[PDB]
Amino acid sequence: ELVNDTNVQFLDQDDDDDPDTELYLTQPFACGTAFAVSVLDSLMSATYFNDNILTLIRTLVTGGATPELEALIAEENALRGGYSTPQTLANRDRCRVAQLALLDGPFADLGDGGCYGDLFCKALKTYNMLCFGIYRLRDAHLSTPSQCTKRYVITNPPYEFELVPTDLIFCLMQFD
Amino acid sequence: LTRSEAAMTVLSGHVVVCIFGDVSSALIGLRNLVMPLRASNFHYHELKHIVFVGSIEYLKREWETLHNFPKVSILPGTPLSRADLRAVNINLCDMCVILSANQNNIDDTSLQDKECILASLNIKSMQFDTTGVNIPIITELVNDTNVQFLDQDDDDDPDTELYLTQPFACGTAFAVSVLDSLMSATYFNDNILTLIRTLVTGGATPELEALIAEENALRGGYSTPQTLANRDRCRVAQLALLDGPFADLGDGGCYGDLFCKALKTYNMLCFGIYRLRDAHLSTPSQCTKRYVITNPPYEFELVPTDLIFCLMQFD
Amino acid sequence: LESVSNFLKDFLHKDRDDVNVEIVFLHNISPNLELEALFKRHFTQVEFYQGSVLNPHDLARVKIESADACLILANKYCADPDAEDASNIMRVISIKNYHPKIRIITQMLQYHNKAHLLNIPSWNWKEGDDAICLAELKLGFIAQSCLAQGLSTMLANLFSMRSFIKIEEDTWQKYY
Amino acid sequence: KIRDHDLLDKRKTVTALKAGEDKSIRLGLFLIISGVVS
């Protein structure tokens, strides 16, 4: 984390430093290795223009903390241990975030230059995964081989988008 | 005592005192609050149990001034933690007193009461196997303009004096600034402060405060007929017009008949009436809030939901 | 001059509709050096006022009975976080006393203090009132990234309003 | 180095009248007063 976001310059030796750039353009933030709190100032506007959006972020990020559960936490502070029941045991069927590699047999057949739209349809129809972003290797566009294991985040690639066997995909896997 | 030990104990009609204390904070002299509740006027089974809620490191300094008293207990904890005030059975208490030892370490003239105000809203927003909005509260204030935030259904206006504001007229707030008027009264009549002293402190005589000046602590005596005859003083109490002695007069009779009856029969000296805020309205309402009428003028009409202040005899 | 900056850049963004509602600001101490320049840069949609949010007199002149919402901002760089967010509760009390039906959007520095908003009898989150807890989201995004890297920078890009941009180059940032 | 810098986007109308309303009223008052004074 960073307290003052202009110090992001010093986290890497092979970027382009310029104090006038916004965090979202800078390499170590685009790679997901830095996170200043100031990027949450934008969340005010979104919460004004749509009330619903903050409730989604809440359920996606906190691990599904329901208004019912935070009432117990408000009253006792600590997390009170329960005794298991069928209704309790049925509660844990939620989805989880994970990332997956195009080197496993289920998808390696499509990972040598196939388009993202086929992978989305296949994964959703077969496993209910909902693939939603791709985490690319920084130098994979270059023909020259390189040792940078650094990556960057692509959100929602537009169907006819081409993928290579070194890419990782974000998805919302089911519980079982 | 711990929450478990307090939950095993049964408390009702007790007084809960919430203290926002700290290791550095000044002494507020809790001996002064306990002392009137220990007047020899009360029978031993009639004494209200007192429980303090606060940080133990504060109570350690006060407590060596008051360990001589009959029923006292401490729950180490924080007034804002609902589990602590659930453990001292707050829904059955007679009074919840909220105090801040802090009133000088922060000099913002605005944020001054913030911790103290939140404690009142927590208790009002509790719920039980009913809601907590009926529980008796009397909180103090450092800066009297913050009185606005104690209730949601008043009219807020910073130019009004405390004596007009609803939570002060109801007797749920008490800032120290109302005692600045006592200077004038003490100048124009010397006698008046001695009456307040005897009425409020529990009869502390110049003879007794000489022993306290010399030894600090309250020295235990051995009983004698002269000692035992000393405890015939009057006590404050309030009474309800639903008991058989006065219910016959509580459906619309005039206060002057009640005064004469009570004084002649029991020597009570009824002196004020504590009315239900909405009792003048024909429309029924859930406001259990009340306000104080001093010295109603004889031909004044009373209703069966009113409570009366009086100075009952000992026996 | 920094606290409003990340807000105004996104609230007055060009890629939203002609939602021309931004017309007010209110805090006791007078503006300073380039904060007045930033207000003059948006001369038509700022309209700052001196005045304290604890006076029902000041609230009455700001016409807060007519306002659609009240956005409350708090300094995450505070010397004592548990003092500021407690202070900030009574800002909510003052507003709800003057008018009960107004939307409150607010930010909280600690997590535990979020319970206090439920005590205020006219706070109802089902009508839109909500508290953005900075520690809850800040540690939440980081925690989520321990399952899949880059998920922090993924989510932080979904809330800020942002134009599509063309890059002719094949550099990594063209796809980003 | 410095990317595409920024974007040229702005859409304003002084609301309808503000500085023009103030100036035209002021000018009218100045002409009223200087008429009476003259």
Swiss-Prot record, chain B:
Phosphorylated. Phosphorylation by kinases such as PKA and/or PKG. In smooth muscles, phosphorylation affects its activity. Palmitoylation by ZDHHC22 and ZDHHC23 within the intracellular linker between the S0 and S1 transmembrane domains regulates localization to the plasma membrane. Depalmitoylated by LYPLA1 and LYPLAL1, leading to retard exit from the trans-Golgi network. The S0 segment is essential for the modulation by the accessory beta subunits KCNMB1, KCNMB2, KCNMB3 and KCNMB4. Ca(2+) binds at residues 148, 151, 154, 156. Widely expressed. Except in myocytes, it is almost ubiquitously expressed. The lineage of its organism: Eukaryota, Metazoa, Chordata, Craniata, Vertebrata. Residues 12-129 form the RCK N-terminal domain. It is found in: Cell membrane. The protein was initially thought to contain two functionally distinct parts: The core channel (from the N-terminus to the S9 segment) that mediates the channel activity, and the cytoplasmic tail (from the S9 segment to the C-terminus) that mediates the calcium sensing. The situation is however more complex, since the core channel also contains binding sites for Ca(2+) and Mg(2+). The chain holds residues 828 to 1179 of 1236 of the full protein. Potassium channel activated by both membrane depolarization or increase in cytosolic Ca(2+) that mediates export of K(+). It is also activated by the concentration of cytosolic Mg(2+). Its activation dampens the excitatory events that elevate the cytosolic Ca(2+) concentration and/or depolarize the cell membrane. It therefore contributes to repolarization of the membrane potential. Residues 168-188 are annotated as: Segment S10. Residues 10-30 are annotated as: Segment S9. Homotetramer; which constitutes the calcium-activated potassium channel. Interacts with RAB11B. Interacts with beta subunits KCNMB1, KCNMB2, KCNMB3 and KCNMB4. Interacts with gamma subunits LRRC26, LRRC38, LRRC52 and LRRC55. Beta and gamma subunits are accessory, and modulate its activity. A motif (Calcium bowl) lies at residues 139-161. It comes from the Eukaryota. It is linked to Paroxysmal non-kinesigenic dyskinesia 3 with or without generalized epilepsy: An autosomal dominant neurologic disorder characterized by absence seizures, generalized tonic-clonic seizures, paroxysmal nonkinesigenic dyskinesia and involuntary dystonic or choreiform movements. Onset is usually in childhood. Patients may have seizures only, dyskinesia only, or both. This is Calcium-activated potassium channel subunit alpha-1. Belongs to the potassium channel family. Calcium-activated (TC 1.A.1.3) subfamily. KCa1.1/KCNMA1 sub-subfamily. It comes from Homo sapiens.
